[PDB]
Design a protein around this ligand. Structure first.
Ligand SMILES: CCCCCCCCCCCCCCCCCC(=O)OC[C@H](COP(=O)([O-])OCC(O)COP(=O)([O-])OC[C@@H](COC(=O)CCCCCCCCCCCCCCCCC)OC(=O)CCCCCCCCCCCCCCCCC)OC(=O)CCCCCCCCCCCCCCCCC
Ligand SMILES: CCCCCCCCCCCCCCCCCC(=O)OC[C@H](COP(=O)(O)OCCN)OC(=O)CCCCCCCCCCCCCCCCC
Ligand SMILES: CCCCCCCCCCCCCCCCCC(=O)OC[C@H](COP(=O)(O)OCCN)OC(=O)CCCCCCCCCCCCCCCCC
Ligand code: SF4
Ligand code: SF4
Ligand SMILES: [Zn+2]
Lengths: 49, 114, 114, 101, 95, 208, 52, 52, 44, 178
């Protein structure tokens, strides 16, 4: 039952990056697909979470 | 001028030890050239041994001669044991060093050092 | 009391007859000390040290209570030390440290700062 | 922290410990990375009176070694008793917290 | 501020610049000479003079313990400003 | 009780002073000086002949039992005719005490090895030979220990320069590391730091 | 070890060669909150020993 | 301040590598015991000698 | 007032340091009984 | 006080029960199984690895990193060429020359730090009377040549102009401990 909770959090991580292209971008650039709160962006385009 | 001896009571006894060490170094050169694969002849190795011994030919104090032999036996030991490497043995030949010229004029042109 | 199972120190074995062994070593030490000159300080002090310990061994038949009096660890360490003192006395007999100072140092040998 | 209750049971059983009570990863139990400013105290020589440096100058109290005996300038010389450098060290007591492993 | 020598090399705030015939200019070929562009001599001169009511003013450079050792500046001479020897700020007496 | 000054007891000074007299009375043949510092450390200064008898006595005597050689080193003082001071630092676990035994040497007067008394001295005596050039008689195996193979000189002598006389580099012509005279892109900058005002009147030397 | 390097770096600014203990005492006082973090580390470490 | 803290000295019996490993493991446990006392007994005041 | 890094009032909670390895597993008999029962069943 | 680490030699008699427990332990490798249990328990633990360089190791305001030369809020250099940093530098990594500036100011004309001599000890920033030389927070400045690590005054002032916002905030956080 608790497995289902885990798999649902996986669905949020996999579908929470802006579609398929957004998931591939972060997955292959950062090797990580966690979702966090956006803390900000600097003038160069770095995004802080 | 009354001093304690180290090993030799007079320069004659010290000369005896010098000759023993010279024999030991002389016999070792061919084994060292062969085992370390040095790119020199055995004759060239024995000439270098001779030149190192004559660097100290002017010493008369038996105690200094005793200590020169003690150090010469140590150097022989690290050569026979192959504790020295090829770089260490080849250091005796100064093969990358441009020797300082000995005449006044050459030293005058180069710089200010006597 | 029951015999010890171990001394607690690696390489030091339990002594079955510590009182006898200590008596032997201390008595032997006092014999060699009679061969020293009467004025030698090593003789006088070592005689005091040894007689004091010999009288404890005579006084106390309990090994545990004897160890408390000797204050030298396990009785086997005391035996070991007793053998060391006897070995020293034989050497001091040949060294003769009681003789006057062999040589003064140079005047400022021990002067610090310079 | 985010392990499922099933995995917690598995790793607790496998290790033989209660791992969840002493996790090696740090969470919110640690200090905040910004702190209020300190206000440190001052030492015992922060006095406006009765504080002359010559009454608290440890370096100027050092003196040369006492010469007990000198073959040069200081002769060292009932039976005088033998002495040790210090009294014998007392035996250590066995721990009462846990004498044996 | 930053000027260029006839060879084109930037001149530093310390006045440094290689000669045209200096071989050591080769080190900047396909690389660059690093020159800080914010000259302190020009920036300190842009500060206004401080007017004060007394003949002695103290400067610690601002920020208290973050500035410089507190020093006292004499403002009796009316033909010039008192300059702080640490931070270069200028002070003048009002009358 | 004066919080910044180090506290002192007289008990250790008295104990160490008395043991210093004891050692001097037993070994007058060798003992040249005994002193106890205000740091409460006893130093026995001996003639070099007394090294083996003195250190044997301190190891084995029942009222001494200095069974652990903490360290063995040298000090170069060029102004002395015997420029090398040989220092033995010994520990007694029985009495929980320390003692220092000092003798001297020059460049042409070896000291006796004390390996028969403390096997610990083996490498220390090699270090003293290597760094200071003091020879030890009857050492089992005396040879350099810290310096490079074929290194010339004794670098801990005061008159051996800090950066030495030779440096190393790889030379591609001969395809090996070679030794060449030292040449420094930046010379070590010597600082003159001593104040010209006297710091410690308790150590002022006679005006002569 | 990596967590203890943080205590070093928090008192001295360096993880290893702190140069923090000097003749006369220590260079700086402990930052606020360091004792609590040393306590948090200390109360779990014996379990880490038990595993080894 | 080592005379103000409580701890035990681990002692070997056989003088071999295994006993020395056990001594070092136990020394870490005794270090935790000292650390705990240092945390609770940390006094206030200055951190270097007041002697400029 | 002076503000330093100090322990909390009352001190910190107690810290475990003694060795703590659990005792676990079956008796020797139960293991041998299970192992011998597997053999006899397999032989059969 | 002392304790024994391996003195459990109260030799006793052996029952059948304990002899069988000893027999089971030897023949069925039970303590070796406990070892596998421990490594298995780690398999199912979350790893301690961070995702460098997207994640970073925690640091503190005291961190000693790449050097910089600072300014006053006006833009005037703080350094007044006292050479206290040069005198104290345990590596002699600092080289300084100075002269009167055109406006008469006491200022440096050379301020070099050999970053390959420096031991990153922070003694210079303690010794500076005006908070001019500091070790900043940057630790990611590895180079492809040795020469790039011989910093001159222009480089060090650019580091100050590059990193002042973070350097100022770290000093505000620690200066009351100094
Ligand atoms: C032998 C092999 C047997 C296979 C067993 C299947 C195990 C399924 C599983 O992983 O659930 C573990 C699940 C979570 O593991 P946990 O250690 O308890 O908690 C860690 C976090 O909660 C973990 O949660 P989280 O915070 O990381 O977020 C949710 C979680 C959701 O992701 C998952 O749970 C992994 C699902 C795959 O993680 C993700 O979001 C990442 C999603 C992408 C998955 C990438 C993993 C590799 C894919 C493997 C696919 C197979 C290869 C195909 C080629 O635990 C269980 O419930 C296991 C019960 C047994 C089920 C069988
Ligand atoms: C009815 C008829 C019944 C008749 C059948 C009765 C059978 C009884 C069962 C006996 C089974 C025993 C198998 C043999 C292994 C063994 O017991 O040997 C133990 C061996 C030596 O143990 P040791 O502590 O070194 O002492 C030496 C003196 N014994 O120690 C070892 O072998 C351990 C080696 C392991 C090395 C690590 C390798 C990985 C182990 C994990 C494996 C996980 C799967
Ligand atoms: C091949 C397997 C050989 C036979 C396996 C049976 C051994 C066993 O029962 O494990 C016992 C062990 C408990 O250890 P212990 O405290 O020494 O037991 C006291 C027994 N009188 O039990 C434990 O350690 C608890 C289980 C932790 C390990 C879980 C992983 C099992 C490893 C076995 C698979 C090997 C691959
Ligand atoms: S950090 Fe230390 S070694 Fe580096 S420049 Fe500063 S004082 Fe010198
Ligand atoms: S950086 Fe600071 S210590 Fe160094 S010369 Fe400049 S003002 Fe003096
Ligand atoms: Zn100012």
């Amino acid at each position: 039952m608790e497995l289902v909770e885990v798999l649902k959090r996986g669905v949020q991580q996999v579908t929470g990056h802006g579609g398929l292209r957004g998931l591939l971008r972060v997955f292959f650039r950062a090797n990580d697909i966690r979702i966090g709160t956006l803390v900000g962006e600097d003038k160069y385009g770095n995004k802080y979470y | 001028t009354s001093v304690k001896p180290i090993f030799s009571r007079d320069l004659n006894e010290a000369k005896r030890r010098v000759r023993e060490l010279y024999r030991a170094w002389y016999r070792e050169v061919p084994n060292t050239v062969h085992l370390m694969q040095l790119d020199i002849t055995v004759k060239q190795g024995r000439d270098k041994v001779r030149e190192m011994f004559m660097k100290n030919a002017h010493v008369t104090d038996p105690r200094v001669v005793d200590l020169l032999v003690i150090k010469g036996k140590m150097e022989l030991q690290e050569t026979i044991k192959v504790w020295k490497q090829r770089t260490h043995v080849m250091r005796f030949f100064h093969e990358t060093e441009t020797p300082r010229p000995k005449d006044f004029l050459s030293k005058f042109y180069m710089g200010h050092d006597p | 009391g029951l015999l010890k199972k171990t001394t607690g120190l690696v390489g030091l074995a339990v002594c079955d007859t510590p009182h006898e062994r200590l008596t032997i070593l201390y008595t032997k030490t006092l014999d060699i000390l009679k061969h020293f000159p009467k004025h030698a300080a090593y003789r006088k002090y070592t005689e005091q040290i040894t007689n004091e310990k010999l009288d404890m061994v005579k006084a106390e038949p309990d090994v545990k209570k004897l160890e408390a009096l000797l204050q030298g660890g396990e009785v086997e360490e005391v035996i070991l030390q007793a053998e060391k003192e006897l070995s020293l006395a034989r050497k001091m007999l040949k060294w003769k440290p009681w003789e006057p100072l062999v040589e003064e140092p140079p005047a400022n040998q021990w002067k610090w700062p310079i | 922290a985010s392990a499922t209750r099933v995995i917690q049971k598995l790793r607790n059983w496998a290790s033989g410990q209660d791992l969840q009570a002493k996790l090696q990863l740090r969470y919110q139990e640690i200090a905040k990375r910004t702190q209020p400013p300190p206000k440190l105290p001052v030492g015992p020589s922060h006095k406006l009176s009765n504080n002359y440096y010559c009454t608290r100058d440890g370096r100027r109290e050092v003196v040369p070694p006492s010469i007990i005996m000198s073959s040069q300038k200081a002769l060292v010389s009932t039976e005088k008793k033998a002495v040790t450098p210090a009294p014998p060290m007392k035996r250590w007591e066995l721990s009462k917290d846990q004498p044996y492993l | 501020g930053v000027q260029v020598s006839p060879s084109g090399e930037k001149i530093t705030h310390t006045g440094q610049v290689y000669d045209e015939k200096d071989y050591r200019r080769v080190r900047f070929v396909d690389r660059q000479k690093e020159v800080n562009e914010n000259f302190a001599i020009d920036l300190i001169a842009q500060q206004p003079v401080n007017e004060v009511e007394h003949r002695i003013i103290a400067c610690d450079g601002g920020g208290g313990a973050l500035g410089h050792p507190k020093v006292y500046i004499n403002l009796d001479k009316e033909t010039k400003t008192g300059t702080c020897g640490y931070c270069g700020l200028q002070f003048k007496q009002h009358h | 009780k004066r919080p910044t000054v180090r506290p002192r007891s007289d008990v250790t000074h008295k104990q160490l002073s008395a043991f210093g007299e004891y050692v001097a009375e037993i070994l007058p043949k060798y003992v040249q000086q005994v002193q106890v510092s205000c740091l409460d450390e006893l130093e026995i200064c001996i003639h070099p002949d007394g090294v083996i008898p003195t250190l044997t006595f301190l190891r084995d005597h029942t009222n001494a039992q200095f069974k652990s050689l903490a360290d063995l080193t040298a000090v170069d003082v060029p102004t002395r005719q015997n420029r090398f001071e040989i220092v033995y630092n010994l520990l007694s676990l029985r009495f929980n005490s320390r003692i220092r035994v000092k003798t001297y040497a020059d460049e042409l007067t070896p000291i006796d090895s004390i390996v028969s008394v403390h096997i610990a001295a083996n490498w220390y005596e090699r270090e003293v030979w290597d760094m200071f050039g003091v020879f030890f008689f009857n050492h089992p195996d005396l040879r350099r220990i810290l310096t490079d193979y074929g290194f010339e000189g004794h670098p801990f002598r005061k008159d051996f320069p800090l950066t030495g006389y030779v440096e190393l580099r790889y030379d591609d012509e001969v395809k090996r590391v070679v030794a060449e005279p030292v040449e420094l892109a930046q010379e070590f900058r010597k600082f003159d730091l001593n104040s010209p005002w006297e710091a410690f009147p308790a150590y002022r030397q006679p005006p002569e | 070890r990596e967590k203890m390097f943080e205590f070093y770096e928090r008192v001295s600014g360096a993880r290893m060669h702190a140069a923090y203990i000097r003749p006369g005492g220590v260079h700086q006082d402990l930052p606020l909150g360091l004792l609590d973090d040393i306590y948090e580390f200390s109360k779990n470490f014996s379990l880490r020993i038990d595993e080894v | 301040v080592y005379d103000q803290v409580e701890f035990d000295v681990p002692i070997g019996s056989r003088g071999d590598c295994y006993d020395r490993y056990l001594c070092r493991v136990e020394e870490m446990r005794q270090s935790l015991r000292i650390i705990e006392q240092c945390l609770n007994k940390m006094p206030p005041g200055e951190i270097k000698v007041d002697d400029a | 007032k002076v503000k330093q890094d100090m322990p909390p009032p009352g001190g910190y909670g107690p810290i475990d340091y003694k060795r703590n390895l659990p005792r676990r597993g079956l008796s020797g008999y139960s293991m041998f009984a299970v192992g011998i029962g597997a053999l006899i069943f397999g032989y059969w | 006080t002392y304790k024994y680490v391996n003195k459990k030699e109260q030799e006793s008699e052996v029952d059948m029960k304990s002899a069988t427990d000893n027999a089971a332990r030897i023949l069925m490798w039970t303590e070796l199984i406990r070892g596998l249990g421990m490594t298995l328990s780690y398999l199912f633990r979350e790893p301690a690895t961070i995702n460098y360089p997207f994640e970073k190791g925690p640091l503190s305001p005291r961190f000693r990193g790449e050097h910089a030369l600072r300014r006053y809020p006006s833009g005037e250099e703080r350094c007044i060429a006292c050479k206290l940093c040069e005198a104290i530098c345990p590596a002699q990594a600092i080289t300084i020359e100075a002269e009167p500036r055109a406006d008469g100011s006491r200022r440096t004309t050379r301020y070099d730090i050999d970053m390959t001599k420096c031991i990153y000890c922070g003694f210079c920033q303690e010794a500076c009377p005006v908070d001019a030389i500091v070790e900043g927070p940057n630790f990611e400045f590895s180079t492809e040549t040795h020469e790039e690590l011989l910093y001159n005054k222009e480089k060090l002032l650019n580091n100050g102009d590059k990193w002042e916002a973070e350097i100022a905030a770290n000093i505000q956080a620690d200066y009351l401990y100094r």
